[PDB]
């Protein structure tokens, strides 16, 4: 029964620590996922704007070829 009392208290600590472990990983997952996603949306949005600049350069160029 002595070795049983050791098993119970040790198991409680193992479960408690596992709860902290899993929670930290679940949190770091969302925080990393949300970071990459938000950066992607900004990267995509800026790219569409840089395409307007390239398009704007061709318009002024196309007019230059008419002068």
């Amino acid at each position: 029964k002595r070795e049983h009392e050791r098993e119970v208290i040790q198991k409680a600590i193992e479960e408690n620590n596992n709860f902290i472990k899993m929670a930290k990983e679940k949190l770091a997952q969302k925080m990393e996922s949300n970071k990459e996603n938000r950066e992607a949306h900004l990267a995509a949005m800026l790219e569409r704007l840089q395409e307007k600049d390239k398009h704007a350069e061709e318009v002024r160029k196309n007019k230059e070829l008419k002068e």
Partner: protein, 421 residues
């Protein structure tokens, strides 16, 4: 601490912008010299939203005047409240746009856009917490339409996480300057859907009818139309300039009024042009809309309204819930509690009590169908295309602008015919 950088562009954009600063200066107790002589402390609690506090307790309006000709901006300086603006924020050109969208967006405006941005950055580094940018311009012109949409795209490159607000002025045959106006409008809308978070549709056809039919004006000048625009803009930013139970900013407005990123065009409304139920019924009336669109021809997505002046808080809450129950067919079911309303204790100048309206109705498609009809009426015969093609453009860009706007209408039609079950 929540600052908002104001920009005005074009002949129309500068005049409707000038009137905006004149009205709100009265509601905050600000003389043309730039000093304060009010009576309430509710005028200086959120004064740093549109004004910068300089030396000598001066409140300089955070506004940037942009144009391609001195003609309009000279009138602002010599007119009332003209000495209150920052002299370095006056960025004007000499060549002009000639009511051409091509010159404003690609040719002329691109030569002056960089000089404007330098002023923008200077007014953004002095912000404790920059909200976003509000732009007042016209879509039936050249500078306001071309360079206006040009500035927006350039701004989002440096400020992508900031909210872009606009007070676009829709052109109309009733108040028409040229014939190439539907072209400039379509090419502008094509940009607005992509680079704006919220846009106020100030239709001139709606403004003309109000002054003509209701206000009884046989010859409605531009001054009469702007008086309705001034009161409209004064209302929609009341909660932004005056403190209350609601902490309001541009983003939070965009979050709650825009269920879909493309459908961000609203329908302004003001009343009057008296009790609470009367003021309420006149606010949802089709004659008191600043956009030529009958709200009963479509359905509402998101609705917001302000009630200024001393009135019963209980009565207002009753009337708003009364207009919903008697008109539950004109509101989508898949958006619960899509009607919000706050009350301001400070009324506008010369009114006991007023009411400003903002609606994201699906009936706004009528405004786009009208412009698209005028657009395709001239584009099918290739009329007046030498103005745009001569600046380096092609028929492909016009096709995209038409196609994108036609898709927008179908999107408004989709969520209108959409049900719950």
């Amino acid at each position: 601490m929540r600052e908002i950088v104001h920009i005005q562009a074009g002949q129309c954009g500068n005049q409707i912008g000038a009137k905006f600063w004149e009205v709100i200066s009265d509601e905050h107790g600000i003389d043309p010299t730039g000093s304060y002589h009010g009576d309430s402390d509710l005028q200086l609690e959120r004064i740093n939203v549109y004004y910068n506090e300089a030396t000598g307790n001066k409140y300089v309006p955070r506004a940037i005047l942009v144009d391609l000709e001195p003609g309009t901006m000279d009138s602002v300086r010599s007119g009332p409240f003209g000495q209150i603006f920052r002299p370095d924020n006056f960025v004007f050109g000499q060549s002009g746009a000639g009511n051409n969208w091509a010159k404003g967006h690609y040719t002329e405006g691109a030569e002056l856009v960089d000089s404007v941005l330098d002023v923008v950055r200077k007014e953004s580094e002095s912000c404790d917490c920059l909200q976003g940018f509000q732009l007042t311009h016209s879509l039936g012109g050249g500078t306001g339409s071309g360079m206006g949409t040009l500035l927006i795209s350039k701004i989002r490159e440096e400020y992508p996480d900031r909210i872009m607000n606009t007070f676009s002025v829709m052109p109309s045959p009733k108040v028409s300057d040229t014939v190439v106006e539907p072209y400039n409008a379509t090419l502008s809308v094509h940009q607005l859907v992509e680079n704006t978070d919220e846009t106020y549709c100030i239709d001139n056809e709606a403004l003309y009818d109000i002054c003509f039919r209701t206000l009884k004006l046989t010859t409605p000048t531009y001054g009469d139309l702007n008086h309705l625009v001034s009161a409209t803009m004064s209302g929609v930013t009341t909660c932004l300039r005056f403190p209350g139970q609601l902490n309001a900013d541009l983003r939070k407005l965009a979050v709650n009024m825009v269920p879909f990123p493309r459908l961000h065009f609203f329908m302004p409304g003001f009343a009057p042009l008296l009790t609470v139920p009367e003021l309420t019924q006149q606010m949802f009336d089709s004659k008191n809309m600043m956009a030529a669109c009958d709200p009963r021809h479509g359905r509402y997505l998101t609705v917001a309204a302000i009630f200024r002046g001393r009135m019963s808080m209980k009565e207002v809450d009753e009337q708003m819930l009364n207009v919903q129950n008697k008109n539950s067919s004109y509101f989508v079911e898949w958006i619960p509690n899509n009607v919000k309303t706050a009350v301001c204790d400070i009324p506008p100048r010369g009114l006991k009590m007023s009411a400003t309206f903002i609606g994201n109705s699906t009936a706004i498609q009528e405004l786009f169908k009208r412009i698209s009809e005028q657009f395709t009426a001239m584009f099918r015969r290739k009329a007046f295309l030498h103005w745009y093609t001569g600046e380096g453009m092609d028929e492909m860009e016009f096709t995209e602008a038409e196609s994108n706007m036609n898709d927008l209408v179908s999107e408004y039609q989709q969520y209108q015919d959409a049900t719950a079950d």
